[PDB]
Design a protein around this ligand. Structure first.
Ligand SMILES: [Mg+2]
Ligand SMILES: [Mg+2]
Ligand SMILES: [Mg+2]
Ligand SMILES: [Mg+2]
Ligand SMILES: [Mg+2]
Ligand SMILES: [Mg+2]
Ligand SMILES: [Mg+2]
Ligand SMILES: [Mg+2]
Ligand SMILES: [Mg+2]
Ligand SMILES: [Mg+2]
Ligand SMILES: [Mg+2]
Ligand SMILES: [Mg+2]
Ligand SMILES: [Mg+2]
Ligand SMILES: [Mg+2]
Ligand SMILES: [Mg+2]
Ligand SMILES: [Mg+2]
Ligand SMILES: [Mg+2]
Ligand SMILES: [Mg+2]
Ligand SMILES: [Mg+2]
Ligand SMILES: [Mg+2]
Ligand SMILES: [Mg+2]
Ligand SMILES: [Mg+2]
Ligand SMILES: [Mg+2]
Ligand SMILES: [Mg+2]
Ligand SMILES: [Mg+2]
Ligand SMILES: [Mg+2]
Lengths: 311, 103, 101, 32, 132, 129
RNA sequence: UAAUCGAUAAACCCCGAUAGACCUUACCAACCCUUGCCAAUUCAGCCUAUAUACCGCCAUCUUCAGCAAACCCUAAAAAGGAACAAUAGUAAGCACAAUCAUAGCACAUAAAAACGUUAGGUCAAGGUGUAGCUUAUGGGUUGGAAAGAAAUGGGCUACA
């Protein structure tokens, strides 16, 4: 299959030139980034599964790795563990155990994880079993358990990976208006067919205006006004701030809730960095994932079914 | 022979097999060389008819109908009217008998 | 050959209905008017009642053009549900995908 | 009598201008 | 159990075209559309005609080109002209192929009263997507 | 190529609105690219936007005979791009649009609206009856 | 009633119909026509009998995890074939899973869901194997049907 890789990489480069010259770019600085744009513009497949869309790529990313020739032309196998049927695995095992033994004679939460099973399977170009993986990782714990030499640490670093974690509600810098020279913050909430936008002015009379009318008149339902009151009563700012509001879509409770989200979002410019995590744990800034569920055909209410008959 | 694809399309179009570009959907349909006042204004064909009778009510209605009708040529609109002249004129009896004198 | 005898019948009803269209239209106009005399309308009544009633519009039945099936046809493709599905599911119908949402 | 002729991609000049090859709307011949 | 346009699992020896191996729910996800025309878009007219038309060209190409047809036949409609692509197996001696090219184009063009363009891409053997 | 010049004062277009309907979003993307790149070379001064997608669904029965508990549903999606061009001449429009339309892909449709500039009709200018 | 057919445990019962005043229509009643749609045919045409001959489309177990070639082992094999400080199992394939869609995540829903099972459904979507009909089980025109003693399935509107 190696002849295929030689050939394919050759034709890949020849077709690479051929691509650049028609697409009219310098063949030198042509990247994969450019390859994509190129094909995407030439063979525009709307298709949802992205692997079935046209590809020109370096055969190495296209084709799977191969297991090399395992024996000389005499029939005689190169690796001494060959007859285990997994040499790739047990070589790691022999080495790991050797490392351990040497450590024993010598000795007298960063976001780092061990490989997945799939990653060790990629590293050794070898199918694996869960048990096997587990065995190995177990062994690496034994390794970490002792005094850690230099090459010891490098060794375990091979099987190390690192993962990101990010939590902060993204903080908008405020915006000072030119007209009054005054600072405002403009939030956008979206709940359930209803979007709202709320501009909050930092020096208020307590005035709250909705779609050009007063909030009492636009929410005659008391419950709604309570929902509105929530963020401000939380941050004790009730009189301090002056808000303008534009909301559309859906029915009243949905609207009051959208304004809740938008407001609580526009209120984190004028609050302290600490009160933010509170509003999170109060659940003010998190959208409501809850929405109507489509009726299903042959049923009644997406859940409700036509009355079922035993006879 | 055809030297190129452009050549191909070119010969098609001169021939009339390809479309003209840019497209105007009225291409190939001249509508008799008629103009708007030969559609909308139907006075011409109402000249022979009782002018104060309910016949005028009716035929003013038909007038308005055919004035608003895109799917017909002038020749067909005319034919409708002439069919009504012929029809009413064929029954003089029923016109006289209904309590109105009709011409 | 049209696929069924029922089809022949309805082909013919289409041709009829195109034939007499304007007689129908014209006559019915008087008939539907409150401005005209009733006397005219009775005679005209007898007149549309006169013309062959295989030539009347409502006597027409859309069918599946390939398969002839009298019900289940989707107006846009003039096809029976079975035939439509059959096509759409080889992918031979453009722009129709199995709907998820 | 069976006929196998190698594709045009074999005679293709690396710098040969493309619109020469594909002037108008085309099926996508894999050969050319 | 959905039987729609599907090809059953055999003893595992059965050769399958990429198209016939991808089941109806897959259209527009992996598989593409075999035809293309304006007619099914929101504001559009005469979808039905292009459907009858399409059907008849499936049957027509299957019948004019016996035993030599590879995979299902790909129709495109562009600005009043048809572009009919075919994957065709190599059986015939090339003369006959061009005979039928001229034959088809002419005949169809005069049938549908619009200019037809024909394309044959010849293939040594049916492409096998799966099994075999 | 043959050009002629006739004395008559060619038509002005304030705004040329070109809508393309389609099925696949890709085709409409590449076509946008093509149209914008044609327009940039012809000095046409254009904008582009994406109007809301339409999705029309409907329902058929899943079997030949009878299980009406069981249906299939089908979709058609119609995706939009609109090229909005400003301040065009008559001929400019004719050519540019000719180039556009000639290259229109098979899966797509195009809906053109021109808004044409005419000063005033003759009988209205400043006579009064 | 002179006056359709089909479904009819779960898997029938606002079911084929997202649909019968004529039409549809297959039904009954009278009348009529015999190379009787087509380019040609001792040929057409048949909603006639076979769904226990079938392809098509589906139901159902089923949101169930298994099915299956190619091999290998068992002081014999009808069949079986794992234990992970592992004791004879390896295996690409199809299922599940994964990804797609519901316009960004995530979950949810949608979809999908093999092999078989029920001789489950349908020769009335269409097409066919076997049989039958051919001045008729074929093709037309005109009318006529779909009444309630009840018995029951599902709905709608109430009982404030
Ligand atoms: Mg409910
Ligand atoms: Mg009707
Ligand atoms: Mg199901
Ligand atoms: Mg029965
Ligand atoms: Mg039965
Ligand atoms: Mg049953
Ligand atoms: Mg029900
Ligand atoms: Mg009836
Ligand atoms: Mg009969
Ligand atoms: Mg029986
Ligand atoms: Mg059965
Ligand atoms: Mg069956
Ligand atoms: Mg399993
Ligand atoms: Mg076994
Ligand atoms: Mg996604
Ligand atoms: Mg999920
Ligand atoms: Mg499901
Ligand atoms: Mg799945
Ligand atoms: Mg049975
Ligand atoms: Mg049963
Ligand atoms: Mg039959
Ligand atoms: Mg037979
Ligand atoms: Mg009879
Ligand atoms: Mg009758
Ligand atoms: Mg009861
Ligand atoms: Mg109730």
């Amino acid at each position: 299959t190696v002849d295929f890789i030689k050939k394919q990489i050759e034709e890949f480069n020849i077709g690479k030139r051929h691509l650049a010259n028609m697409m009219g770019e310098d063949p030198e600085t042509f990247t994969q980034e450019d390859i994509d744009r190129a094909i995407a513009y030439l063979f525009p497949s709307g298709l949802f599964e992205k692997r079935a869309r046209p590809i020109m790529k370096h055969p190495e990313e296209i084709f799977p790795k191969q297991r090399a020739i395992q024996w000389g032309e005499d029939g005689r196998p190169f690796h001494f563990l060959f007859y285990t049927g997994k040499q790739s695995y047990y070589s790691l095992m022999h080495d790991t155990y050797g490392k351990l033994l040497d450590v024993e004679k010598h000795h007298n939460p960063i976001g780092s994880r061990w490989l997945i099973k799939e990653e060790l399977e990629e590293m050794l170009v070898e199918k694996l079993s869960d048990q096997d993986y587990a065995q190995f990782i177990r062994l690496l714990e034994r390794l970490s358990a002792l005094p850690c030499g230099a090459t010891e640490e490098d060794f375990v670093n091979r099987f190390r990976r690192s993962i990101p974690x990010x939590x902060x509600x993204x903080x908008x810098x405020x915006x000072x208006x030119x007209x009054x020279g005054m600072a405002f913050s403009r939030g956008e909430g979206k709940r359930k067919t209803a979007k709202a936008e709320v501009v909050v002015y930092g020096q208020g009379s307590g005035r709250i205006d909705v779609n050009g009318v007063d909030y009492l008149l636009y929410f005659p339902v008391t419950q709604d006004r309570e929902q509105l009151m929530f963020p401000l009563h939380f941050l004790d700012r009730l009189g301090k701030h002056d808000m303008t509001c534009a909301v559309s879509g859906g029915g009243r409770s949905a609207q009051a809730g959208a304004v809740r989200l938008a407001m609580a979002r526009a209120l984190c410019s004028f609050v302290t960095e600490d009160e933010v995590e509170w509003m999170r744990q109060a659940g003010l800034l998190t959208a409501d994932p809850r929405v109507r569920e489509r009726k299903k055909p042959g049923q009644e209410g997406a859940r409700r079914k036509f009355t079922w008959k035993k006879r | 022979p055809f030297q190129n694809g452009f050549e191909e399309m070119i010969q098609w179009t001169k021939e009339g097999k390809l479309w003209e570009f840019p497209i105007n959907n009225e291409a190939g349909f001249d509508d008799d060389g008629s103009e708007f006042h030969e559609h909308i204004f139907l006075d011409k064909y109402l000249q022979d008819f009782p002018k104060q009778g309910p016949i005028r009510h009716f035929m003013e209605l038909v007038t308005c109908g055919l004035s608003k009708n895109p799917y017909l040529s002038v020749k067909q609109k005319v034919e409708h009217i002439e069919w009504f002249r012929n029809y009413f004129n064929e029954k003089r009896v029923i016109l006289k008998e209904s309590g109105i004198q009709l011409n | 050959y049209y696929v069924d005898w029922k089809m022949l019948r309805d082909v013919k009803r289409r041709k009829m209905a195109y034939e007499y269209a304007d007689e129908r239209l014209r006559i019915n106009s008087l008939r539907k008017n409150t401005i005209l005399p009733k006397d005219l309308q009775e005679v005209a009544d007898e007149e549309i009642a006169s013309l062959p009633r295989d030539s009347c519009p409502v006597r027409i039945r859309n069918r599946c053009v390939m398969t002839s099936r009298p019900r289940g046809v989707k107006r846009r493709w003039r096809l029976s549900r079975i035939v439509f599905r059959h096509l759409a599911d080889h992918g031979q119908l453009s722009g129709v995908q199995r709907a998820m949402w | 009598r069976r006929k196998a002729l190698p594709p045009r991609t074999e005679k293709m000049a690396v710098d040969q201008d493309w619109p020469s090859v594909y002037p108008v709307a085309a099926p996508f011949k894999p050969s050319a | 159990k959905n039987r729609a346009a599907r090809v059953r699992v055999s003893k595992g020896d059965k050769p399958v075209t990429y198209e016939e191996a991808h089941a109806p729910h897959y259209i527009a996800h992996r598989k593409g559309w075999l035809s293309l025309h304006t007619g099914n878009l929101d504001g559009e007219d005469h979808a039905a005609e292009r459907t009858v038309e399409d059907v008849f060209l499936r049957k027509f190409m299957l019948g004019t080109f016996p035993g030599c047809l590879a995979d299902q036949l790909v129709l495109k409609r562009r600005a009043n002209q048809l572009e009919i692509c075919a994957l065709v197996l190599r059986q015939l001696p090339p003369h006959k192929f061009y005979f039928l090219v001229g034959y088809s184009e002419t005949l169809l063009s005069h049938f549908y009263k619009c200019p037809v363009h024909l394309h044959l891409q010849t293939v040594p053997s049916k492409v096998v997507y799966k099994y075999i | 190529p043959e050009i002629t010049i006739s004395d008559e004062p060619d038509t002005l277009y304030k705004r040329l609105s070109v809508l393309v309907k389609g099925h696949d979003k890709a085709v409409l993307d590449s076509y946008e690219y093509f149209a914008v790149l044609a327009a940039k070379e012809l000095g046409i001064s254009i904008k582009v936007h994406e109007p809301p997608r339409k999705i029309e669904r409907f329902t058929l029965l899943k079997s030949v005979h009878i299980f009406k508990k069981h249906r299939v549903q089908y979709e058609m999606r119609t995706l939009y791009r609109c090229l909005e061009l400003e301040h065009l001449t008559g001929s400019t429009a004719d050519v540019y649009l000719e180039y556009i339309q000639r290259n229109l892909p098979e899966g797509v449709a195009m809906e053109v609206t021109k808004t044409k500039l005419e000063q005033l009709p003759e009988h209205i200018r400043k006579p009064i009856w």
